[PDB]
């Protein structure tokens, strides 16, 4: 249960006369903020999304982000003109931090272009990604001439961000520690082959995300369990399906076991009987 603060930006530049920047902020697995291009401010998704920041501190960050958005779009379009990059361009920003209790804090600011890392903020300066195109080196040089932006980003990453994470953890402690019980059910699946069965175990509605689901005979875990991806529900719960390829005779006495924090040490066990 680690709760990193991830601020994500998705900027698309097509037609040179069409661009959009969208953003969101995640605390762990919960989306805490949304930033749409047609709105002037970042929108809070939770009653505790402001953390322990005062009203003025949050509005200060809002002004910072409006300037950041307009300046980023203009700087990217100027970069496209100075070098030979063809539109459309797909820039992504992943920035944020993680707080160790009482010891240290760490942060990151990674930029991707067409899905590939191109540069990052290290220490006090911009550094290009390993095996980066040659023109990115010219971009680093211009960015490193701007000491005010480097100072502001360093202030945000090393000072503002850890306090924001701490405030969000304290203020939204009730929702982060929330426990929602999953409901599970068994099913049949497309036959793998002749004389065989695909046992399916659905588990849906659990929060938080960590979960354990396996097919098994009593206490022995069937090492052939095929866990799928943990997929999101609209109400911020999760869904997971677990399957097992089995001889029809072996399906007798087999059960699906679910371990989740909401269960208070007990497990949900579903036996193959219907």
């Amino acid at each position, epitope marked *: 249960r680690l709760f990193p603060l991830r601020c994500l930006q998705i900027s698309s530049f097509a037609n040179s006369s069409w661009t959009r920047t969208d953003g969101l902020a995640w605390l762990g697995e919960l989306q805490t903020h949304s930033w749409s291009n047609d709105s002037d401010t970042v929108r809070s998704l939770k009653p505790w999304s402001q953390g322990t920041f005062s009203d003025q501190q949050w509005e200060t960050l809002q002004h910072i982000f409006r300037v950041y958005r307009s300046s980023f779009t203009r700087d990217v379009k100027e970069f496209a003109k100075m070098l030979r990059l063809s539109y459309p361009l797909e820039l992504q920003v992943s920035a944020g931090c993680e707080v160790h209790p*009482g010891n240290a804090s760490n942060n990151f600011f990674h930029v991707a272009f067409q899905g590939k890392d191109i540069l990052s903020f290290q220490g006090t300066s911009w550094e290009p990604t390993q095996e980066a195109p040659l023109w990115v080196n010219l971009a680093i040089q211009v960015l490193n001439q701007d000491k005010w932006t480097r100072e502001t980003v360093q202030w945000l990453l090393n000072g503002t961000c850890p306090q924001f994470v701490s405030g969000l953890l304290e203020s939204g402690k009730s929702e982060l520690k929330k426990q929602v019980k999953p409901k599970a059910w068994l099913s049949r699946g497309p036959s793998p082959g002749p004389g065989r069965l695909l046992l399916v175990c659905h588990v849906s509605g659990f929060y938080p995300k960590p979960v354990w689901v396996k097919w*098994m005979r*009593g206490e022995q*875990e069937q090492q052939g369990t095929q866990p799928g991806d943990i997929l999101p529900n609209a109400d911020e719960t999760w869904y997971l399906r677990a399957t097992l390829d089995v001889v029809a005779g072996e399906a007798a006495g087999l059960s699906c076991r679910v371990k989740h924090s909401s*269960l208070e*040490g007990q*497990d*949900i*066990v579903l036996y193959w009987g219907s």
Partner: T-cell receptor, first 111, second 117 residues
Framework: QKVTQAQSSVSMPVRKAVTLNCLYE???????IFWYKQLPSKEMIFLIR?????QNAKSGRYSVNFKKAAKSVALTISALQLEDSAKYFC??????????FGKGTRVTVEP | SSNLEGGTKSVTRPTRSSAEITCDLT??????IHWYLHQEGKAPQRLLY??????????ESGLSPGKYYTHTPRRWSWILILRNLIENDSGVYYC???????????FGSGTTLVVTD
């Protein structure tokens, strides 16, 4: 092969670093010391492992201070949370066999 | 609710009878199932262990044979049976095992045995 935890009950405020003492008397060349946590509902939970071969180990907020000559394994918990209040146990054993436990030390995190 | 099983449990039995203690632990490839007893104010100690592959019980020295029996009602499921229950048998009984690479020893939820006549 004996394990002793001299401290019985220890109290400490939040966000501090508490230390539990453990002294073992063994003759094995190779062995392991485990630190477990016991909950009010009587549930054992593995916290840390420190064998006689490696250096001092840590995992998250749990660290271990190891001295072979004086036979000391001191557990250190950093930045205590309100859920840390529990009974911590020190155990000594070799792989695939029994564990020799101490009587445990109760740690109470005060607000 | 009707499909929940495991977790912390208690078994209350009179003296001079037998007690069954369940194991909610989960294994990948377990050759042995250890049984530990924890009494209030005392260090947890292992009483015996069960050889699963060969279905045997090995008791710690000083324990009378037949007092403890590990039973396999269903495949890969284990229950500890205590005979001739005395007041001193009260305490929390855990089932435990080493993981696949013998890194750590996992313990079960535990069952509080209360022996009162």
């Amino acid at each position: 092969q004996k394990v002793t935890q001299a401290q019985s009950s220890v109290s400490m405020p939040v966000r501090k670093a508490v230390t539990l003492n453990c002294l073992y008397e063994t003759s094995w060349w190779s062995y392991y010391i485990f630190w477990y946590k016991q909950l009010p509902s009587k549930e054992m939970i593995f916290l840390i492992r420190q064998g006689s071969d490696e250096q001092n180990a840590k995992s998250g907020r749990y660290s271990v201070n190891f001295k072979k000559a004086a036979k000391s394994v001191a557990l250190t918990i950093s930045a205590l949370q309100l859920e840390d209040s529990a009974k911590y146990f020190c155990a000594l054993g070799v792989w695939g066999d029994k564990l020799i436990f101490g009587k445990g030390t109760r740690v109470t995190v005060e607000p | 609710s009707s499909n929940l099983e495991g977790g912390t449990k208690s078994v209350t039995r009179p003296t001079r009878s037998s007690a069954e203690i369940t194991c909610d632990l989960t294994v990948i490839n377990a050759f042995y199932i250890h049984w530990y007893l924890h009494q209030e104010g005392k260090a947890p100690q292992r009483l015996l262990y069960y050889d699963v592959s060969n279905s045997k019980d090995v008791l710690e020295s000083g324990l009378s044979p037949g007092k403890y029996y590990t039973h396999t009602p269903r495949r890969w499921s284990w229950i500890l049976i205590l005979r001739n229950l005395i007041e001193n048998d009260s305490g929390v009984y855990y089932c435990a095992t080493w993981d696949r690479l013998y890194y750590k020893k996992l313990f079960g939820s535990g069952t509080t045995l209360v022996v009162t006549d």
